[PDB]
């Protein structure tokens with residue numbers, strides 16, 4: 067048959083996507099972490115920041131830490147592809163702008179308004195139409 071790495075094979079494919087090439091916050095080209103809560107791909111820098119928030123999200127390195135199928139699939143079915151958009155529902159290049167990716171205070175104060183405040187928080191359950199329009 068074939069052997070090399072279990073699960074990891076599916077991971078390298080996730081962080082490989084063109085919508086993951088960069089971080090979720092600092093948009094740094096080269097993510098080394100993944101949020102189990104949001105289901106996105108962050109880096110060591112952000113990974114640590116997110117925790118500071120409350121409640122503290124869940125982050126796990128990509129190479130420093132391993133993952134299981136139940137997890138991989140969860141991250142694959144999510145990915146920054148839709149995740150981001152779902153968090154940027156209201157966000158509009160015109161409505162607002164993007165901070166800098168050098169200072170933590172800036173990335174933090176912003177990340178909060180996305181999670182702590184959930185300003186541009188627009189889930190799909192409602193975004194799309196269905197048999198139940200609350």
Ligand SMILES: [Zn+2]
Pocket residue numbers: 089090091092093094108109110111112113
């Ligand atoms: Zn980052």
